[PDB]
Design a protein around this ligand. Structure first.
Ligand code: CN3
Ligand code: 8PE
Ligand code: 8PE
Ligand code: HEC
Ligand code: HEC
Ligand code: HEC
Ligand code: HEC
Ligand code: HEC
Ligand code: UQ6
Ligand code: UQ6
Ligand code: 6PH
Ligand code: 6PH
Ligand code: 9PE
Ligand code: 9PE
Lengths: 93, 385, 126, 248, 72, 51, 385
């Protein structure tokens, strides 16, 4: 097969990261490891941490656009009622 | 060597779904790709087993769909899976493209991957529109009419293009037959584009939610991301089973069970739920030609995205203002859909115009300016002089 | 795609002015510690995307010990993001340790590529 | 639009087949067919409902056969090519009262009565809309509404002006089981019958939904366990780093 | 020639060009009658007018029209 | 002693542009081939002596 | 490096049709592969543009085919190209498989390539049969009936399999509709198998008409075999244009223009011209179950071919007796086709049985014995003792 260009991911053995030295791993078999030991206290406190650091960036745009949609929908159902029909007459023309 | 490495066929299965080096920090948002693959297989298999009972004449389309839902054994399962799975296909694809915009997967060296993604998105919109016109309900007929008249807006040529599309003078029997043939055809082009998408992905590997390299700590595909994708596969099938079996006709429009009548126009012509932002973008422009150009530019402005992101760090993970304006953009897209679902009434015209402007301003003004300000803020926060 | 000479010019114009520095350096480090890359145990020069040949050059330029330290900070960041936790407060990168260590290597590679492009497109003094 | 063009919002009636476990009331479907045949079937076709679907659902075998043999359908012609008729059987469809569209528009002042095979699935609101449509005619329209002559008022129809007559009055039919047949009773019965006609799969759809949701919820929890199991070697992995000797 | 063949095979066929025109009778429609037909996939309103309706048509001032146009 | 460049040179652009006009001309000849038989273009396409 | 080598997409185009090292001694028989690719593209494009006008009901199939041949502009070109191109597709495929048997391309290391070729052959026979039943003429209806009753020969299960295939109790509207859906579907499986075929080819390169290695003198694909394939492409289009425009209905059977009548059986039910050897093989066995097993074994006996060729030189080029018995086999296959076209009459039954026996004896007895004798003859011709 032909050669190809320089990529930024190699394969197992020549992956292409920087050379690393003196960094040791430690892992235990999952047969001697108890899974889901960290669901209780975890799904409460870590989930509250993940919500607290991260909710306000979602809650302010939702608040802005929901308030703007609600004000627009309220103004719609105002001016297509009997009370605002002359205003509908002057803004539709 | 091993047989999964030395065989010609199993080497692709190996290097794609067994020994593919994935970054070990990717969360469940890097699972929508496998989920889209599963949902495409669902769409194709239900499409074949439901198109064995479908007759594509204009006088026999709606009756054959009802023949599927009534006389065919388990045919309601097939049609409800098919329509609601197309809805979930676009929902998972929207979440996948939002994962692309958020974590900066569009940036270099993954521009080819992003462009093939946009091509897949256009082909999928085309497939869904053609298959929705194959039902030939009320909404199907009148939506086909409105979209092809939008193609008649093209100057000096367009009327003959539309008489070519229709195969006649209005939406008639040749139109529905060629929409069924094209609708059978284009998903295999989508499958070929998906294979090209996987190639352009595999030449550099996935990104990670930090925006740094992942060449240091790679873990294989097999058993790790196989069982993580199996988790989200079972969740996706659970939610699809809810919206198929307990509430099937929620996402659809009830006018689509009226047969196609060319004489009666509906009170409100609305596409199916996911094409509504694009329909709102097109309806916000007070011109037919500029409306069609703006509707296609609303997808090509995703192609102009890697050239405007001037942020020197990849992805919106560790940046404040870019993350905030990203969620401004997402809820703006939802607001486009909800504007498009409404009528052409005060003040929805003005809000549709402002919402279209904030869409294009996010893709063209907000991202480069906020990325430049965020770069200078990162620099002067830590450099003292 | 910011071309580090440009961001360095803007940042030095902000820092050398007293009014602009007094105005937007508190905004700057407030932005930094709301960004939260410290809490994963990273520095900002560990965070610049390195998949373009000029940054790849500036990583070849780097000394050995800082390269091994950068490799350890990346692997601890991937492991901490994998467990969906944060590093404990004793292991966060402090404000004094967030040194722009890779910036001069990047800037000299910037000046080298800029000079190569200019000399590749010169006229002649007729 | 105003609320008049949009039509009044049909409320939430507590049907006996709402909820993810409740099925149809088949006695109510039987009585709904009786009210259909004696009231609606003068002016509404039911073109997509075969006779065989009522066998074992709302009527027995001989009841459907002796209701289908009262009607005449087109037989294959005889040995001289003359067209002939035949009595109905189980495989035929429920015939409409009108031979074509123009006879319908002639007999109903121009307005075409829509086929009721899918009418509870082709209107927003559905069951509540059909019930409020039938039981929603005022005795007289509100003050200031000029109806076109030949049309009727009820607020639930979009626009207010409908071309239907109020065709549910007190005790116009008799029930076989002796149920008091008021207007609301008959309207509830025909709305349940039309829900059956649009959704004949409804019973089997909900029980297969029960099976599928149980099996997929169990699979989802089992797969969460196996993902937390096979990732346990990678979640708990630890890294220490003593920086190497700088002489090399 | 190949592109012409495969693209012109998707245009309007012969039989849908056959039903492109309708040939309604002037002598068969009465005076005070409106005729609504499905022609070319579209509705068409047909009316035999009286000369007083002609006089009513061509004598309304153009400022009462947002798109003014004469009767002829 | 600089130049106006964006990785493409202004000298290179003026070197290729008298060929790019011929490329536009040959593309218009290509459209003139592939768009006859289309009766909308034949209002323009038969004038001198193809008729 | 060059852009055709460094790009992800163009590297496949490069390594397959530009810089592929081909042996420089291959003649025009190594051109049928490109010719089959061109003819498959012809079949697919005419199938799409002709299936935009096709309605697959049993009461509307034959009328829609005649609507294509009469009312559709240039529709006679489409149908005549389509049917006569299917005939040329099987003729070029028969010549390609004969090139495979003659020059020994089935031998090691190309057994995977040969097996994927046999899979493509089975799928193509299936596609042609389904599309011939989609016409719903007289021959279409009765051929579908005979082939599915042959599937009813399977013991203890077969009647329910056939009621599953028919979708009813005889060849009716669901049968023709599902044959049209399957017939639209299976050519894309053929395209995927063709891509797998090209992969299994590309891992070892083509053979050569000498049976020796070709690693010494390779010439590229580009301009050399590009223009050689262009020569045979223009010859193939010339002969296809003759049999489309001047004599279109020669290869077909004239009974196929009678509409499908379940009551009238024809005087002679015969498939289209290329399935006749297999029909003769099946008709020669005096049993239904053994007939169906023998008809499928007549294709699986091509899979048992690389394990019986005991010749130590590759290909029949430099061997006398193997070349002679190869042409015995080829003219025997033609004689099978001509026996199958005839009636069940004396002496065509006895000749059909002898011809089937010589078919299986060539694949199982003649090739190993003649190859062993040819090996020993090559040895003792030049070794003196
Ligand atoms: C609408 C129709 C779509 C149909 C698609 C079906 C699939 C839905 C996919 C939704 C999704 O992918 O969101 C992923 C989001 C981010 O995940 P993360 O990696 O940051 O969290 C790590 C986790 O703690 C690891 O914990 P672990 O991996 O051990 O288990 C994860 C969890 C599986 O749940 C999910 O996959 C999402 C519901 O197992 C459970 O314990 C469930 C308990 C009942 O999960 C979250 O943590 C939620 C954050 C907010 C997202 C809201 C989404 C609104 C659109
Ligand atoms: C035409 C182009 C197509 C454009 C598509 C438009 C958008 C389609 C909408 C699809 C919804 C997808 C939501 C966005 C998906 C990406 C969000 C995400 O990446 O989640 C992670 C985000 C931040 O997490 P981090 O990765 O930064 O955590 C690192 C820890 N230090 O975590 C978060 O900040 C919270 C994520 C919560 C998601 C909220 C989704 C809201 C969905 C709309 C609701 C509509 C009803 C109002
Ligand atoms: C189910 C399994 C399917 C099996 C399919 C069985 C065959 C079906 C019919 C296909 C016919 C194709 C036959 C092609 C024969 C293989 C090609 C070939 O062998 O040609 C080369 C051959 C010898 O050439 P050399 O390579 O030996 O040259 C030596 C140079 N020193 O040159 C020659 O010896 C002369 C070549 C003459 C070709 C004439 C073709 C005959 C076609 C018969 C049609 C009969 C109609 C009446
Ligand atoms: C035959 C193959 C086939 C394939 C492949 C296929 N569909 Fe469809 N699809 C159909 C048929 C037939 C219908 C019409 C019958 C129906 O709507 O139930 C249809 C209808 C639809 C509808 C309208 C459903 C409704 O009832 O409103 C949508 C939406 C749709 N397809 C989307 C898709 C998408 C998205 C894909 C794949 C990316 C896809 N289809 C692939 C056959 C197919
Ligand atoms: C829609 C896609 C389509 C594809 C792809 C396709 N065909 Fe067909 N084919 C048809 C249709 C439609 C018909 C029936 C109309 C006709 O026969 O003209 C047909 C008919 C046929 C017929 C019968 C022709 C006749 O009139 O007797 C044959 C033989 C055939 N196909 C073979 C093939 C082969 C071989 C291939 C590819 C390997 C193929 N087809 C691919 C659509 C297709
Ligand atoms: C418009 C954008 C876009 C669309 C639409 C899109 N993709 Fe992707 N896809 C991407 C990007 C970008 C990535 C890589 C992102 C990353 O790794 O940071 C990706 C990655 C993937 C992956 C690898 C796993 C993953 O999540 O990264 C798969 C599998 C995949 N896509 C399949 C599909 C399929 C199947 C479809 C629909 C047929 C599809 N994609 C549609 C942009 C897209
Ligand atoms: C007097 C004749 C007549 C009878 C009897 C009759 N209908 Fe109607 N119905 C109509 C007409 C006419 C329409 C069409 C209304 C319209 O188009 O404005 C109609 C329309 C309807 C509609 C649709 C209304 C809408 O706005 O979509 C429903 C539902 C309906 N009928 C239910 C029934 C039921 C149930 C019965 C039996 C109790 C019944 N009808 C008996 C004449 C009748
Ligand atoms: C069962 C036999 C067989 C079938 C059927 C078959 N192939 Fe081949 N094909 C081969 C063999 C064997 C070769 C290798 C030629 C050799 O011996 O060197 C080959 C080689 C090729 C080549 C390379 C060019 C050449 O002539 O070798 C192409 C292209 C090709 N096949 C395409 C196809 C296509 C396309 C089809 C049908 C769609 C097909 N083949 C069906 C056996 C087959
Ligand atoms: C050994 O040396 C080689 C060699 O290595 C190779 C590669 C080849 C070349 C092999 C081939 C060319 C075969 C390749 C065949 C395929 C890849 C099959 C793909 C076929 C298709 C038809 C692709 C599918 C595409 C479509 C269906 C698109 C059609 C869509 C249409 C027409 C839409 C029309 C609708 C509208 C609205 C325009 C050789 O010939 C060869 O010998 C010299
Ligand atoms: C990045 O790492 C990867 C990765 O590399 C890959 C490949 C995937 C997997 C992605 C995919 C598999 C998506 C690709 C999807 C396709 C290629 C679609 C293929 C589907 C088809 C071609 C259609 C299926 C067709 C059939 C099954 C044919 C049989 C059908 C029928 C109806 C025959 C029935 C007829 C009878 C008579 C029984 C990942 O999910 C992933 O992330 C972990
Ligand atoms: C083409 C369609 C794409 C859909 C995307 C699907 C992505 C997830 C695929 C999951 C495959 C699981 C195989 C794991 C495996 O074989 O591990 C095997 C054995 O594992 C198992 O037995 C898993 C138990 C059986 C699970 C069956 C799940 C079937 C439901 C699939 C639903 C989606 C099709 C190897 O495991 P080991 O290496 O840890 O020893
Ligand atoms: C997918 C379908 C497969 C079909 C198999 C077709 C196999 C042959 C393909 C021929 C392509 C010719 C390109 C040669 C080329 O570009 O050389 C180019 C220039 O050559 C030419 O200009 C050739 C003149 C134009 C010939 C046009 C033929 C079109 C008819 C094609 C009919 C079949 C589709 C490079 O030539 P050079 O390297 O010698 O300089
Ligand atoms: C949608 C696919 C689009 C194209 C992408 C290609 C990827 C295809 C993925 C297919 C994965 C499953 C294939 C498993 C086949 C492995 C068996 C094998 O390679 O054994 C092969 C033989 O293969 C065959 O005979 C039949 C293969 C037909 C495959 C049809 C599916 C053994 O051959 P071997 O590699 O040991 O070479 C020794 C040479 N004598
Ligand atoms: C099952 C397989 C089916 C067949 C798929 C495999 C065969 C595919 C052959 C495709 C041949 C045509 C592709 C040539 C396009 C090359 C352009 C290119 O690669 O530039 C790509 C960008 O491509 C795109 O943006 C969209 C390409 C979508 C292709 C849609 C057909 C840039 O690539 P690159 O990163 O090497 O450039 C660096 C700049 N110096």
């Amino acid at each position: 097969g032909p050669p190809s260009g320089k990529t930024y991911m190699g394969w197992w053995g020549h992956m292409g990261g920087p050379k690393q030295k003196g960094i040791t791993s430690y892992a235990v078999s999952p047969y001697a490891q108890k899974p889901l030991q960290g669901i209780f206290h975890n799904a409460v406190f870590n989930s509250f941490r993940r919500f607290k650091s991260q909710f306000l960036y979602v809650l302010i745009p939702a608040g802005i656009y929901w308030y703007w949609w609600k004000n627009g929908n309220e103004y719609n159902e105002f001016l297509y009622s009997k009370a605002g029909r002359e205003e509908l007459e002057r803004v539709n023309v | 060597m091993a047989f999964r490495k030395s065989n010609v066929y199993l080497s692709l299965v190996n290097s794609y779904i067994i020994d593919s080096p994935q970054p070990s920090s990717i969360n469940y948002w890097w699972n929508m790709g496998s989920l889209l693959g599963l949902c495409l297989v669902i769409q194709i298999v239900t499409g074949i087993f439901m198109a064995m009972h479908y007759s594509s004449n204009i006088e026999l389309a709606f009756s054959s769909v009802e023949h599927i839902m009534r006389d065919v054994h388990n045919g309601y399962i097939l049609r409800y899976l098919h329509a609601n799975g197309a809805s979930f296909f676009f929902m998972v694809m929207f979440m996948h493209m939002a994962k692309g915009l958020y974590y900066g997967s569009y940036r270099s060296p993954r521009v080819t991957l992003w462009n093939v993604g946009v091509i897949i998105f256009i082909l999928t919109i085309a497939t869904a529109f053609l298959g929705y016109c194959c039902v030939y309900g009320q909404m199907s007929h009148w939506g086909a009419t409105v979209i092809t008249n939008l193609f008649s807006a093209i100057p000096f040529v367009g009327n003959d293009i539309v008489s070519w599309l229709w195969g006649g003078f209005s939406v008639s029997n040749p139109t529905i037959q060629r929409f069924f043939a094209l609708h059978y055809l284009v998903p295999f082009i989508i499958a070929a584009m998906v294979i090209m998408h996987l190639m352009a992905l595999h030449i550099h590997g996935s990104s990670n939610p930090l925006g740094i390299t992942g060449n240091l700590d790679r873990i294989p595909m097999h058993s790790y991301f196989i069982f993580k994708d199996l988790v989200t596969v079972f969740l996706f099938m659970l939610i699809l089973a809810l919206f198929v079996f307990y509430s099937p006709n929620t996402l659809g429009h009830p006018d689509n069970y009226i047969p196609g009548n060319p004489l009666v126009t509906p009170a409100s012509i609305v596409p199916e739920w996911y094409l509504l932002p694009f329909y709102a973008i097109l309806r916000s422009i007070p011109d037919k030609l500029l409306g069609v150009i703006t509707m296609f530019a609303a997808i090509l402005v995703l192609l102009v995205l890697p050239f405007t992101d001037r942020s020197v760090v990849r992805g919106n993970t560790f940046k404040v203002l870019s993350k905030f304006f990203f969620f401004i953009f997402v809820f703006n897209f939802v607001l486009l859909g909800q504007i498009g679902a409404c009528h052409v009434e005060v003040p929805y015209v003005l809000m549709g115009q402002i919402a279209t402007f904030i869409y294009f301003a996010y893709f063209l003004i907000i991202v480069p300016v906020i990325s430049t300000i965020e770069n200078v803020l990162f620099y002067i926060g830590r450099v003292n002089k | 795609p910011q071309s580090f000479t440009s961001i360095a010019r803007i940042g030095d114009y902000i820092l050398k002015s007293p009014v602009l520095s007094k105005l937007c350096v508190p905004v700057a480090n407030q932005f930094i510690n709301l960004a939260g890359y410290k809490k994963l145990g990273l520095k900002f020069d560990d965070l610049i995307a390195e998949e373009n040949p000029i940054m790849q050059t500036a990583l070849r330029r780097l000394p050995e010990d800082e390269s091994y330290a950068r490799a350890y900070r990346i692997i601890r960041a991937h492991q901490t993001e994998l467990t969906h936790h944060l590093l404990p407060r004793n292991e966060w990168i402090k404000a004094q340790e967030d040194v722009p260590y890779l910036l001069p290597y990047i800037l000299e590679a910037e000046a080298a590529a800029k000079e190569k492009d200019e000399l590749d497109n010169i006229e002649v003094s007729k | 639009m105003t609320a008049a063009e949009h039509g009044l919002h049909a409320p939430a009636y507590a049907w006996s087949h709402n909820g993810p476990f409740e099925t149809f009331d088949h006695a109510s479907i039987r009585r709904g067919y009786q009210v259909y045949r004696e009231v609606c079937a003068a002016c509404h076709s039911l073109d997509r409902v075969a006779w065989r679907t009522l066998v074992g659902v709302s009527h027995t075998n001989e009841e459907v056969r002796n209701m289908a043999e009262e009607f005449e359908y087109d037989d294959e012609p005889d040995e001289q090519g003359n067209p002939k008729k035949r009595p109905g059987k189980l495989s035929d469809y429920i015939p409409g009262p009108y031979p074509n569209e123009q006879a319908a528009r002639a007999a109903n002042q121009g307005a075409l009565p829509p086929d009721l095979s899918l009418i509870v699935k082709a209107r927003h609101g559905g069951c509540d809309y059909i019930f409020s449509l039938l039981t929603g005619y005022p005795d007289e329209p509100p003050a200031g509404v000029a109806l076109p002559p030949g049309s009727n008022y009820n607020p639930y129809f979009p626009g207010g002006s409908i071309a239907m007559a109020r065709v549910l009055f007190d005790d116009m039919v008799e029930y076989e089981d002796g149920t008091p047949a008021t207007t609301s009773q008959m309207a509830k019965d025909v709305t349940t019958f039309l829900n059956w006609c649009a959704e004949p799969e409804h019973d089997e759809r909900k029980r297969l939904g029960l099976k599928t949701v149980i099996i997929l919820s169990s699979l989802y929890l089992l797969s969460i366990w196996v993902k937390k199991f096979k990732w346990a070697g990678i979640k708990t992995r630890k890294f220490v780093f003593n920086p190497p000797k700088p002489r090399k | 020639s190949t592109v012409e063949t495969f693209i012109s095979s998707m245009t309007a066929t012969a039989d849908v060009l056959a039903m492109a025109k309708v040939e309604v009778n002037l002598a068969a429609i009465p005076l005070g009658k409106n005729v609504v037909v499905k022609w070319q996939g579209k509705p068409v309103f047909i009316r035999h007018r009286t000369p007083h309706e002609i006089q009513e048509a061509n004598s309304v001032d153009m400022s009462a029209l947002k798109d003014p146009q004469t009767d002829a | 002693t600089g130049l106006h460049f964006g990785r493409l040179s202004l000298r290179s652009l003026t070197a290729y542009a008298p060929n790019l006009m011929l490329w536009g001309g040959a593309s218009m000849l290509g459209l003139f081939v592939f768009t006859e038989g289309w009766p909308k273009f034949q209002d323009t396409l038969y004038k001198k002596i193809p008729l």
